[PDB]
Amino acid sequence: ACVHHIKRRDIVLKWELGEGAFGKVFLAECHNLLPKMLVAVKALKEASARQDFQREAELLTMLQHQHIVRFFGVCTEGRPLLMVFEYMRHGDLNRFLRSHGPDAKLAGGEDVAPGPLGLGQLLAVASQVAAGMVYLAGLHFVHRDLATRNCLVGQGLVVKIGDFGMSRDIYSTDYYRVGGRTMLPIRWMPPESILYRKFTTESDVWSFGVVLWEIFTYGKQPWYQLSNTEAIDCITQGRELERPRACPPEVYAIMRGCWQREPQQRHSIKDVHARLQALAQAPPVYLDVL
Ligand SMILES: Cc1cn(-c2cc(NC(=O)c3cc4cc(c3C)C#Cc3cnc5ccc(nn35)NCCC(=O)NCCCCO4)cc(C(F)(F)F)c2)cn1
């Protein structure tokens, strides 16, 4: 620390936002912070736990990017220990995708169109996540849990990458429990991770392709038809995911580039970003023929 601190008197808890196996989240007001405003603070079911606290906090202060969830600091004066995050109006990206497509019948508010998310908004979401992964790959930080459930959405449809937390709880359909003390998002993992237990930046690229998949299917779980073991089988043996139907061939071409068996044979995340960004800012005329 080397970590910003926030006095408790500046933080006023309003109500709970969510609850994890080890942490709670409250929506709260935070005074004398900027330049008054709303923040999301997390409390800790302390057990030991006071070690991983000032570990995550130091990391989050190092990770400052336009597409990584902002971290304002901590409150260590007294208990419980708090981490002050910025508040993202629309919650996690998976809940946002499911609630806006393909029905979605009107269903859009202040930041989002009525019906299902347009091709331009889908590409805009993917581009932002890729942009966040380029940053993390630039610092050689491996995420090991890249999914929509770990991405937050704020006002003006700002997508930012984070790491729950909540994910382990009530999203347990997305995890395979092994050993009793460890769960694995095997549906998002590359073959060299499932088999060889190896996680690299190239493993994140595979994960992003699966995230890029999710976006164009509105939050639907990968290999939804399959069980945990069956999903492992298909990924190991080298089965690829479907594309229908909001995904243009040009975009599915990007997913497969992330889904090469050999990690070195995959494309860089900077490359994937470049293609997704161009497609995002491309004119309607170009996008209507995709
Ligand atoms: C191994 C390792 C990983 N990291 C690492 C950790 C991280 N942390 C995180 O992303 C993190 C962790 C966390 C909470 C939040 C975030 C963003 C948040 C938030 C937030 C802002 N507005 C809202 C509105 C509703 C909700 N949350 N919310 N739902 C309530 C969530 C729940 O119901 N349970 C969540 C409570 C418990 C979780 O506590 C981000 C990154 C990185 F990706 F940014 F680098 C890396 C550090 N070490």
Tell me roughly what share of residues is in helical segments.
Answer: 25-40%
Compute the number of strand runs: 9
H-E order: EEEHEEHHEEEEHHHHHH
Shape: globular
Motif (DXXLL): 36-39, 103-106
Binding site for ATP: 17-25, 42
Site (Interaction with PLCG1): 286
Subcellular location: Cell membrane; Early endosome membrane; Late endosome membrane; Recycling endosome membrane
Account of the protein in words:
The structure is a monomer. The protein has 290 residues and is α+β, with helices and mostly antiparallel strands. It has 2 domains: 8-86, Phosphorylase Kinase, domain 1, CATH 3.30.200.20; 91-289, Transferase(Phosphotransferase) domain 1 (Transferase(Phosphotransferase), domain 1). The protein is built from 9 helices and 9 strands. The protein has a 5-stranded antiparallel beta sheet, covered by helices on one side. Strands 6-7 form a two-stranded antiparallel ribbon. It has a two-stranded antiparallel ribbon with strand order 8-9. A hairpin with a 6-residue loop joins strand 4 (71-75) and strand 5 (82-86). Bound molecules: ligand A6X. Residues 11-276 form the Protein kinase domain. Belongs to the protein kinase superfamily. Tyr protein kinase family. Insulin receptor subfamily. ATP binds at residues 17-25, 42. This is High affinity nerve growth factor receptor.
SSE layout and pairing:
Layout: E1 11-19, E2 23-30, E3 37-44, H1 49-62, E4 71-75, E5 82-86, H2 93-98, H3 119-138, E6 151-154, E7 158-161, E8 176-178, E9 182-184, H4 191-194, H5 201-215, H6 228-237, H7 249-258, H8 269-281, H9 284-287
Antiparallel strand pairs: 1-2, 2-3, 3-5, 4-5, 6-7, 8-9
Bound molecules: ligand A6X.
PDB class: transferase
Keywords: transferase
Assembly: monomeric
